[PDB]
């Protein structure tokens, strides 16, 4: 997720507001702003494409086995969406490191709500309100 | 909020500069995967450092097996015609 | 196999079709020239289910940020499965003798721990730092 | 062989034609006088696939800037394959006996770790610093 | 997959500046592709001036180790002391004995197996004779 | 032989005529009173090719500026070839018994590492400082 | 061998790089940039065509019997050519006090490699890499 | 023999007439009561050629200015040849048994190294300081 | 090789000019002014009689295994020739510790060029310009 | 150019004198090959030194197996009539 200013590209600050951040171990290499889920004891990996795999967003780039700062629910975040989104849309991890809408996904409940709409491939602002795990 | 590892903050970290300076000084080639940890390549953004072995002093220091003439340890970029 | 043995956990193995389980069983049976043909399917399935469970519980996590299962997770689970089937069969034969014919193998014990006791275990043991303890932490 | 065993990874081996695999299998079979002719193709293929995987995961990377696999990568993978096939056959015969006579081999109760347990493994071990730990790093 | 790299220069003063005509890598043999521009050598002779010291992108200034230098370079076959070698067409060297050429450009001072790094003294250059 | 075994590397061996290979094979077969006549040509060729490859990779380079192959390179490669035709034959025999007739050899107790495990490897070791590590370097 | 700048003609400097400069006696009158070979004991004369006659290039004009300085192999030099030359052409003495390509000559090996191309009668830049004597 | 075995190097051996070689072969065959009569000429020739090569390369030069071959060079090369021929026949017979009776020989716990491994080797070993390392040098 | 001055024999200074000296290990005993070739890894031995065996000339007398200084190519040397030679002659190692001409040898190219002629068994002055190795 | 080992320079080297003096004092025969290194014979040109053992003090010293008179260790060229 990046912003252009003249010649320059700047990384966006991922976390807009919130105090709900916690440390985990990377189960694989991760990039800043990716949605992640529990994949072992205190170990987080990149979320797959539908429901049941979301704990928060990764705040900085990591190699496998590194300590991860994660922003959970109760946080407002700048996140890239893979499709066009609008205010009030519930969004969900896309499986591609992006988010997408609940409406587009196979699922029926989101993890964050869009506060500021965006086009496909572009940074929205969203509030993370929930987590999802293995329900069967 | 920003952390020292967060992508927009890396240019302010003294350690990011110092470790990129190290990486340029210790490399022999642009092939990072061979020479550095995945952790180092990510943490110091080594893909974006101009690493190629051209800044490593050992690229230029002579190290022959037999040294009759005290030639070993001379650095070519310190000679008269450099 | 369709799902590989390293892609399934204990609960996933139970959720597989019989065919997906049989493909994995067939792969494990390649690790012995006899295929353990006289051992029944239920026992091979139990050995694999156990090897999956034991991988996920005893041979998972990190030591000094390095993964404990350092080798290929597929072959580690297959060798761990073969180790179990060989113990369900009674152990390694050190010697076999029959109608005049006899053979004796170099399958003398390398040590007294579980994985040391069969050739498949001695192989699985290389994939997992030979059960050594290279873990390390700081305080902050 | 056209692609050589050192030129293929586990993913590449799976992508080979049957003939390209059979050329590598045939090369491995040259490492025993018996050719392991009574062991089936599936088992010989499994041993080679495992030897390739194990090379790329356990015997890759550097220690003190020297490659871990210091010998010829072709013959290392072939000996690692022959080692596995001999373990799928039950281990080394220390002794064999029957109608045609008896022979005892000077295996000499060698070692405890898997590669030490067969002649092919003992050969493979010399290609890889004998599994010694010569790694070294600085700080800066 | 990836071998640990090496100091290509052992000893010798005869380093000269050229422009890279393409992306080039440490130890790669090169020849003149334009006015003071160098590119990776073809096989079978007529294309050697020296070896590139360090990795460069196309159009960048490049330091080339010429004849009179001692260098360590990758060989595509086994070589032994007193073997003559020349560019292989593949970023490596091979022996004169293997190649279609009759004369080399460097002499092996320390032997190496295929895909390993030998130590060699560069003593000649080759261009277009037609 | 026309080209001697010390003149040829792995890629040279592959380029030789069948006759130039057969001359070298015949020279290796002189190193056993049996000639290993029951092993096929491919297995003798694979052993020689492997011995050439292994010489060039594991038994090359310098220690304290001394060559690591101190002995005659021809006979070293031949003994290393014989070491590998043995081992393809199974190990070195300790005892052999037939129709009443029996023999036992002083081949036991040789050691645990590869070249120690047959008389040919025990000969080959003397050519290569007995696998000792007499290397040394200064800083400048 | 000369360079123009406005109305003026300047002499070219024959030597671009190298320390391999050696002293001989001139066996005849010689001119800067002319190829020469050993005509007698430490005596050098202008090279004839088709090889077997090259020790280096004369560095400055001399009368017969004067001590002459010569650039040998390992030098980069500026020299006149009888024909169009291009980078990577091997060149050797033409008998005319100039170089030509190996391709044009009856010879099969050169003495200098062209580093910068030039047209007929112009000055190329070349690296001297070999000497040629009598082999019979 | 007219040219003696100590007067010929490896290249000289190849240049001898068949009779001159056969004289030296005949002398070597005197070192066993059986003469190794069932081993062919080519194998005895190879053993002698190898012993000459090994003498000139491994058991030559000086050691604290003393010659490293301290004993008679003739008998050393003969014992080194006999050692090789015995190893081509499989090594020392520790025990032999058949219809004509049985015998066991006092070979005992012979050491790990090749020259220790046969009686001829142990004889040759006394000619070359028992392989001891008594070399010395000084800086001037 | 020797000057005579009254009662006295003086050894000739082998190296006339040249900066490219390099150190090697002796593979055998060698004497000053002998041509040598590579015979092992950084090990030099006396050159045999035709082409393919020349790295330089040994500068001082050595026992086997001692360190050797070579004058390589780019050096001018005082060397004994086994036959009468003239300026411009290419010369080659003779197999006898001397040099001889290319014309007399079985080879087709030399390693040094005579600058100052000499009789058989006499010291010429020559410039070393090439090495030779195993081409097959 | 002349190195320290070069044949025309050996007479300038202090070590060439010191070591030739040592060799004469140490020697027990003119047969150099019996006693000196190939290195020593070459480096110090010992063929050209008049080595014969006549300069070795132990050529002249008594060393009888039983000595009741304290005669051992006396050097005959230090007697009255020498
Ligand atoms: K979808
Ligand atoms: K070769
Ligand atoms: K080719
Ligand atoms: K013409
Ligand atoms: K001749
Ligand atoms: Mg809040
Ligand atoms: Mg690992
Ligand atoms: Mg190595
Ligand atoms: Mg220069
Ligand atoms: Mg030069
Ligand atoms: Mg004695
Ligand atoms: Mg000069």
mmCIF file of N, CA, C and O and ligand atoms in Angstrom, chain A residues 49-50 94 100 104-106, ligand 1:
data_model
loop_
_atom_site.group_PDB
_atom_site.id
_atom_site.type_symbol
_atom_site.label_atom_id
_atom_site.label_comp_id
_atom_site.label_asym_id
_atom_site.label_seq_id
_atom_site.Cartn_x
_atom_site.Cartn_y
_atom_site.Cartn_z
ATOM 1 N N UNK A 49 -8.947 -17.111 1.374
ATOM 2 C CA UNK A 49 -9.823 -16.281 0.553
ATOM 3 C C UNK A 49 -11.247 -16.064 1.085
ATOM 4 O O UNK A 49 -11.896 -15.123 0.622
ATOM 5 N N UNK A 50 -11.770 -16.905 2.000
ATOM 6 C CA UNK A 50 -13.117 -16.712 2.548
ATOM 7 C C UNK A 50 -13.104 -16.534 4.075
ATOM 8 O O UNK A 50 -12.136 -16.026 4.635
ATOM 9 N N UNK A 94 -9.090 -11.219 1.437
ATOM 10 C CA UNK A 94 -9.318 -11.593 0.052
ATOM 11 C C UNK A 94 -8.572 -12.871 -0.364
ATOM 12 O O UNK A 94 -8.798 -13.400 -1.455
ATOM 13 N N UNK A 100 -11.559 -7.699 0.330
ATOM 14 C CA UNK A 100 -12.681 -7.565 -0.591
ATOM 15 C C UNK A 100 -13.983 -7.502 0.211
ATOM 16 O O UNK A 100 -13.979 -7.739 1.412
ATOM 17 N N UNK A 104 -18.988 -9.832 -2.217
ATOM 18 C CA UNK A 104 -18.258 -10.536 -3.266
ATOM 19 C C UNK A 104 -17.793 -11.925 -2.827
ATOM 20 O O UNK A 104 -17.755 -12.853 -3.640
ATOM 21 N N UNK A 105 -17.409 -12.074 -1.553
ATOM 22 C CA UNK A 105 -16.894 -13.323 -1.002
ATOM 23 C C UNK A 105 -17.955 -14.436 -0.972
ATOM 24 O O UNK A 105 -19.142 -14.180 -1.159
ATOM 25 N N UNK A 106 -17.542 -15.678 -0.673
ATOM 26 C CA UNK A 106 -18.482 -16.763 -0.399
ATOM 27 C C UNK A 106 -19.083 -16.688 1.012
ATOM 28 O O UNK A 106 -20.083 -17.355 1.294
HETATM 29 K K1 LIG K 1 -14.206 -15.312 -4.565
#
